[PDB]
Amino acid sequence: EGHSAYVALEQRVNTRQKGIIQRHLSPYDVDIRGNGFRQIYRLGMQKIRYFGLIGTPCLLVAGAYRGIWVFCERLEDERYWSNAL
Amino acid sequence: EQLDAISREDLIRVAHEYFYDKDPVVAVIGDTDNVPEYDALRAVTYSVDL
């Protein structure tokens, strides 16, 4: 795990760590149900919001392309029904 | 008087009751860059052979 690029980056950038305290519980003392439904609900809310944000350019371009597709389909139907091919 | 009445089998039973495949508590002060994390330590309280 040493002699690696990310370890070298840590040593170059970050200081000598001091003043950090970490508390860990054993998985046998943590209930898997835990913070389950709350996390499901709030992550779902966040994803709905984010996808509503970043999906709207796609929705607009899809609407425009659907308009063009409908035009082309009806044009080709008229062409084939009139023996104009 | 109670110290000469202890049996080696009793001592082994006490040692096995509280050490083997149990959850420990670890405290570390210093360069935690090299001290193993809890998960690994929890996986060495038992052996495949037993």
Side-chain angles (χ1 to χ4, degrees):
Chain A
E1 192 184 5
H3 302 297
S4 66
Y6 60 99
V7 168
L9 180 68
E10 293 166 9
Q11 295 180 355
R12 289 197 320 267
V13 175
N14 289 356
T15 47
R16 305 295 299 176
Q17 305 307 324
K18 179 188 186 302
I20 309 160
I21 312 171
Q22 291 186 315
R23 172 83 182 88
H24 296 307
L25 291 159
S26 72
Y28 296 87
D29 297 315
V30 181
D31 191 358
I32 71 162
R33 280 168 291 175
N35 189 25
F37 291 121
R38 175 181 177 278
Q39 278 292 314
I40 283 171
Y41 175 83
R42 63 187 305 282
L43 259 55
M45 168 178 57
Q46 290 181 7
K47 295 211 189 310
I48 287 176
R49 286 198 156 205
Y50 198 69
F51 297 167
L53 271 179
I54 74 175
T56 50
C58 189
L59 276 177
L60 302 182
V61 173
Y65 288 177
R66 180 60 184 179
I68 297 177
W69 195 295
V70 170
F71 167 82
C72 291
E73 276 187 0
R74 70 162 52 101
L75 178 77
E76 298 295 330
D77 296 341
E78 297 170 15
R79 171 172 292 112
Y80 270 88
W81 271 95
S82 301
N83 287 276
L85 185 72
Chain B
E1 166 54 16
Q2 301 187 26
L3 187 52
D4 294 324
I6 293 180
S7 299
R8 199 166 75 255
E9 286 67 27
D10 299 331
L11 200 74
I12 290 174
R13 290 185 188 92
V14 173
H16 182 270
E17 230 292 352
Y18 303 130
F19 286 160
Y20 191 84
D21 192 1
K22 290 291 188 306
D23 306 322
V25 54
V26 188
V28 179
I29 296 178
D31 189 8
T32 62
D33 200 334
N34 301 339
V35 180
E37 286 69 13
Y38 179 74
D39 52 322
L41 283 172
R42 180 59 180 86
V44 295
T45 53
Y46 55 89
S47 60
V48 59
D49 190 323
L50 311 156

